[PDB]
Paper text:
Attempts to solve the crystal structures by molecular replacement were unsuccessful. Thus the selenium-methionine variant of [name] was expressed, purified, and crystallized for experimental determination of the phases. The monosaccharides N-acetylgalactosamine ([name]) and α-methyl galactoside (GalαOMe) displayed a similar millimolar affinity with a Kd of 2.2 and 2.8 mM, respectively. Clear electron density for three [name] monosaccharides is observed in the lectin domain, corresponding to the three sites α, β and γ, classically observed in the β-trefoil structure. The axial O4 of α[name] establishes hydrogen bonds with the side chain of conserved His and Arg residues in all sites. Moreover, each [name] is stabilized in the binding pocket by a C-π-stacking interaction between its hydrophobic face and the aromatic ring of His (site α and β) or Tyr (site γ).
TrefLec was searched for original domain combinations, which led to single out [name] in the choanoflagellate [name], that contains both β-trefoil and aerolysin-like pore-forming domains. Recombinant [name] is shown to bind galactose and derivatives, with a stronger affinity for cancer-related α-galactosylated epitopes such as the glycosphingolipid [name], when embedded in giant unilamellar vesicles or cell membranes. [name] is composed of two domains, a β-trefoil domain at the N-terminal region shown in blue and an elongated domain (green) consisting of seven β-strands forming a twisted β-sheet. The lectin-binding step is necessary for the pore-formation since the pre-incubation with a high affinity galactose derivative diminishes or abolishes hemolysis, GUVs penetration, and cytotoxicity.
Author numbering: 4 to 328
The structure:
Amino acid sequence: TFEPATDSPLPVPGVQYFLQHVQSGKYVHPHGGSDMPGNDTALVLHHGFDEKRDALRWVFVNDAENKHQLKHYSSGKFVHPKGGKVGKEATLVVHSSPGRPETMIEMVQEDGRTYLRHTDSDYYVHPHGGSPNPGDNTRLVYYSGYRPSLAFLAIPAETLFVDRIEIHQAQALESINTITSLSDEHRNDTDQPVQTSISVALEESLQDSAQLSFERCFGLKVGSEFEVGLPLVGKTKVSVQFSGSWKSSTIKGEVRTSAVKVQINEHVTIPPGKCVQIRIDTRRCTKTAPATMYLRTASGIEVQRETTVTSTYHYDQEVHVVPVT
Ligand SMILES: CC(=O)N[C@@H]1[C@@H](O)[C@@H](O)[C@@H](CO)O[C@H]1O
């Protein structure tokens, strides 16, 4: 299963998220839930959720213009300490004023969980009163230190398009192997040559597969199925069709074009008194590489996600009639 505390993805800057306090399940809203909250309106936790509500959406900003800020998607307001100083019980509020070093806020990983933290400080984001299950409309504050109960989950709140995945060629590992299948023995106990049907079923032996793996979870929404060209043996690209969920730590990939045969059917003239076998020799490329996924928002920002590509691919099949003596 997806374990929200141990699998929570780190948010990608410029992408829309919902913020969820893991322990309560409550979401981060401006107080009053407006899409146009006022200056010095508090961030609070509330059970309320509606995928379609833009006032629920937040965007992590980290660019030349703004370093380590959090933005309210519907209003464009940044998240500030109330009064302009991060300190004990300083309420998080939205405000139209641009961000500063003294307002920095980012999601960070500490001992396997994701937390909101004022950058370059020991201040993290707590629910006022520090309850593992705060009540609706509890305000979020800055406070020294962190503990599991404060963990947040950034849930992707828009669907991206996967443009391409680029293998890191220098750390790409390749293990080539020969899968050898022998049919049953067939013997010709007549006094004339018999042309005999010999079949072998190799569906489970020669199953092709591709996997994208992530330390926590993919953490992006990209649709039901997506297709990319992956180099499944040497540098030769093959079309792989992936389906998963943002919560997946492993996305399974299907190979469209099979390069070998999984049903072997040979017509073999067996001479009088002779025994034969079909020998199938199939090559398997077992591959692993770090890779960068390149994805696009509808708003047109290109974003990246590191992954590990793993694949089993079968090529260069040979069939031979071997004598059984
Ligand atoms: C020991 C303890 O839980 N203290 C918490 C403190 O850590 C912080 O979460 C604060 C925020 O208001 O609430 C307090 O109750």
